[PDB]
């Protein structure tokens, strides 16, 4: 063991363990002076151009703004930003949805509906402040006392290419709309209902990209008991964004509204 510490805004935090890594950043599970648990993202800035800098600034301002508007955006309690570093002290999470999906045996229908609702609310909120994530996937969500929270806003830059909307693959917000996030949410719900994503069993990752965009390539929707849930998935996974369902539509759909 150690007595390793972080000072952020003068307050001391003992480190319990590291949890995130990589891009000039680390996340740490942490104890404050009142022994209360938190998470602290750290970012080293020596190596960061003005664009990566302006993005980090932007994530922080949005995390700030959105807090007020929803309890499904991950809570930021305090931050310290300097020419050399950023420290952010955030509420702490049991596990991320991505790791949770893979270990969870089956999945309670009343639990999935609730996680769906959570996800809808969070994305709806960011949409109402003109953020269109565009790279949604289970990792972007965190379970905190049985409640999904959005952590990332697709705002500040092998990954699973298994939640990726058709229109993202066309250039390769005049091409990407809010409807892009519906697709991705659709895939996350598709995992939670049929145990796997639409093109999980598809071969070379390039070979998936063809099926995503291919309009003659049908996605299967087995008859599950929840008829409403089956419709949600079909409406979310339409290739044309013009015909794909909207988030405000999805919040009025009987799946989320009748129980
Ligand atoms: C990068 C970033 C992170 C966060 C952020 C905030 C709180 C938080 N609490 C937790 N808690 C855990 C603990 C464990 C696991 C897990 O299942 N693991 C399996 C293998 O990979 C390592 C850990 C996931 C989450 N994570 N986590 C992250 C917020 C924001 C806003 C960012 O930008």
Ligand 1 pocket check for 152: Cβ under 6 Å: yes
Residue 17 structure tokens = 């363990």
Helix (H, G, I), strand (E, B) or coil at 213: helix
Q: How far apart are CA 215 and CA 48, in angstroms?
A: 41
Place of tokens 């003109």: 130
Q: 138 near 130, Cβ under 8 Å?
A: no
Query: What's the CATH number of domain 95-259, 3.30.1490.20, 3.30.420.10, 1.10.510.10, 3.40.50.880?
Result: 1.10.510.10
Domain 6-94 homologous superfamily, CATH: Phosphorylase Kinase; domain 1 (3.30.200.20)
Structure solved via: X-ray
CA–CA separation, 66 vs 130, rounded Å? Answer: 11
The CA-atom distances, in angstroms, between 127 and each of 131, 132, 134, 170 are 5, 6, 11, 22
Dist. CA 132–CA 115, nearest whole Å? 20
* 11, containing H or E segment: strand 11-20
* Resolution of the model in angstroms: 2.6
Q: Is 74 in the pocket of ligand 1 (CB under 6 A)?
A: yes
**Ligand 1 pocket, mutate which of 17, 22, 27, 78 (most atoms under 8 A from CB):** 27
Task: Provide the phi-psi class of 134: left if phi over 0, else alpha when psi is between -120 and 50, else beta.
Answer: left
Residue 76 near ligand 1, beta carbon < 6 Å: no
Integer Cα distance of 79 and 8 in angstroms: 7
List the domain boundaries for the chain: 6-94, 95-259
């Amino acid at each position: 063991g150690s007595n390793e510490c972080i000072s952020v805004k003068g307050r001391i935090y003992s480190i319990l363990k590291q949890i995130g890594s990589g891009g000039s950043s680390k996340v740490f599970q942490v104890l404050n002076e009142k022994k209360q648990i938190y998470a602290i993202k750290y970012v080293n800035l020596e190596e960061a151009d003005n664009q990566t800098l302006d993005s980090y600034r932007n994530e922080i301002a949005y995390l700030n703004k959105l807090q007020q508007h929803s309890d499904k955006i991950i809570r930021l309690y305090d931050y310290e930003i300097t020419d050399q570093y950023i420290y952010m002290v955030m509420e702490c999470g049991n596990i991320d949805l991505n790791s949770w999906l893979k270990k969870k045996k089956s999945i309670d229908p009343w639990e999935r509906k609730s996680y769906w609702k959570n996800m809808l609310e969070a994305v709806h909120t960011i949409h109402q402040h003109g953020i269109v994530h565009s790279d949604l996937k289970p990792a972007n969500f965190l379970i905190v006392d049985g409640m999904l929270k959005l952590i990332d806003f697709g705002i500040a830059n092998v990954g699973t290419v298994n939640y990726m909307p058709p229109e993202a693959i066309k250039d390769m917000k005049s091409k990407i709309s809010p409807k892009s996030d519906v697709w991705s949410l659709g895939c996350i719900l598709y995992y939670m209902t049929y145990g796997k994503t639409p093109f999980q069993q598809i071969i070379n990752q390039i070979s998936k990209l063809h099926a995503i965009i291919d309009p003659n390539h049908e996605i299967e929707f087995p008859d599950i008991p929840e008829k409403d849930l089956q419709d949600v998935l079909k409406c979310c996974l339409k290739r044309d964004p013009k015909q794909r369902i909207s988030i405000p539509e999805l919040l009025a759909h009987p799946y989320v509204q009748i129980q």
